[PDB]
């Protein structure tokens, strides 16, 4: 089963986390986004949103969707 969530990257730099994610799961694009960005309920299994704070630290567990 391919890895689809990265709890161990919470608290890390989001741009570094995006690189790791795209290496561990070859079928996803990782996107660093500011936490709280309004998103619709569109499920994109090839996307991992990496939610970060004002210092670009990951604040939520990244997962596909």
UniProtKB/Swiss-Prot annotation:
Coiled-coil regions listed in the entry: none
Complex and partners: Monomer and homodimer; disulfide-linked.
Similarity field: Belongs to the protease inhibitor I13 (potato type I serine protease inhibitor) family.
Superkingdom of origin organism: Eukaryota
The keyword Disulfide bond appears for this protein: yes
Protein name from the UniProt record: Protease inhibitor HPI
MF terms (GO), sorted A to Z: serine-type endopeptidase inhibitor activity
Gene this chain is encoded by: PI1
Keyword Hydrolase carried by entry: no
